[PDB]
């Protein structure tokens, strides 16, 4: 059918889109807010005020980039609708809300009000015929071919693990701590001011984000490597100024493992996953030692996987098999898993009909997603 489903790969900071069966999302872009800040007299500027694209990524000195997705939980749903209208733009989709099924990606254990308000959007403003939201973990296993596993991921300020065998109902066996790289970038900015580099703008912060995600690693031996001497090699600004390596690009991401340094009692991914293993059953934990379904795009740094394996060695007992899912396209793999998921037979019954929203919607939405 020409009414092919719509795969929308969300994320706390990144979002992708496409159709069913497609292998690459032709539309990949962030999640933010933006509006101009100065005054022109001579005409010939761009209008619309909320731009997404090269102009947005060019006229950064004008817009006020914000982020409504507080740990993914969005608050400027209206602005998101504006963004979704942009998703339907003349160069983006050119389709109408009442023309295609829509599969949506998600982060679990969120309040019902989220799905409520989303249903209101895509069934009143937008009017989707078939809308469904689910867990990317299943999509991840689809993209990897596995069926059972401990699916862990990292967004931008969100992290969560789903240790489940073949989609079996194990809600008590699920862990989630939503914290990641955004504050690490702000923490990096803190280090910058610590050695005299103050930054405050949204665009400025995004440049810092580029610095972070561009230059960061993990020195396996914290104390030991600290005793040694660094390089402090300098990258250069658009103007070309000093960007040293510092203790920063490796000491700052370790805060994700020693979260108390930010001033917050937490556990660190390793302990989190260990607790998740304890949340499992001894008659399955061996497979779970083999079941290491890792993901998360923020995770893509140096000194990450193998050092984390050493962490596991310190944590897990004897006889544990490392079987880590780790291509860098695990983000896209969620979108791809949803694409193949959309290309299915039973998928019709899997979604939510529009008439169901016309009848009740809400409770039925929670019933179909569970």
């Amino acid at each position: 059918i020409a009414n092919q489903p719509v795969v929308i790969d969300n994320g706390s900071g990144v979002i992708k889109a496409g159709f069913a069966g497609d292998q690459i999302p032709k539309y990949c872009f962030p999640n933010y807010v933006g509006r101009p800040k100065h005054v022109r007299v001579m005409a010939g500027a761009l209008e619309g005020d909320i731009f997404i694209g090269p102009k947005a990524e060019e006229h950064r000195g004008l817009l006020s980039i914000r982020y409504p997705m507080e740990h993914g939980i969005v608050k400027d749903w209206n602005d998101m609708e504006r963004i979704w209208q942009y998703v339907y733009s003349k160069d983006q989709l050119q389709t109408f809300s009442e023309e295609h099924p829509v599969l949506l990606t998600e982060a679990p254990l969120n309040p019902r009000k989220n799905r409520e308000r989303a249903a209101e959007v895509f069934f009143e403003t937008f009017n989707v015929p078939a809308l469904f939201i689910s867990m990317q973990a299943v999509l991840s296993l689809y993209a990897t071919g596995r069926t059972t596993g401990v699916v862990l991921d990292s967004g931008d300020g969100v992290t969560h693990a789903v240790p489940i065998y073949e989609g079996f109902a194990m809600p008590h066996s699920i862990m989630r701590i939503d914290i990641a790289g955004r504050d690490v970038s702000r923490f990096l900015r803190l280090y910058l001011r610590k050695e005299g580099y103050d930054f405050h703008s949204s665009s400025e912060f995004e440049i810092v984000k580029a610095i972070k995600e561009r230059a960061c690693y993990l020195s396996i031996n914290p104390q030991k490597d600290e005793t040694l001497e660094t390089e402090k090699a300098q990258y250069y600004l658009p103007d070309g100024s000093t960007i040293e390596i510092g203790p920063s690009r490796f000491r700052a991401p370790e805060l994700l493992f020693r979260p108390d340094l930010i001033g917050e009692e937490s556990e660190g991914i390793h302990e989190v996953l260990v607790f998740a293993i304890q949340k499992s059953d001894m008659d399955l934990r061996r497979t779970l030692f083999s079941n290491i379904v890792l993901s998360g795009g923020s995770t893509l740094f140096k000194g990450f996987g193998d050092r984390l394996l050493s962490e596991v060695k310190k944590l897990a007992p004897k006889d544990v098999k490392i079987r880590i899912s780790a291509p860098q396209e695990r983000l896209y793999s969620t979108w791809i898993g949803g694409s193949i998921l959309a290309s299915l037979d039973t998928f019709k019954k899997m979604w939510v009909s529009k008439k169901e929203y016309e009848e009740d919607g809400a409770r039925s939405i929670h019933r179909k997603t569970f």
């Binding site: 996987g305 394996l309 098999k321 490392i322 780790a326 860098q328 896209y332």
Partner: peptide
């Protein structure tokens, strides 16, 4: 493949699965 070309990139000189030491 063009899949890795059109995107920012996949794993660089490092696999996905690893393994512990012999006789753990």
């Amino acid at each position: 493949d063009p899949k890795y070309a059109d995107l920012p990139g996949i794993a660089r000189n490092e696999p996905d699965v690893y393994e512990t030491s012999d006789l753990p």
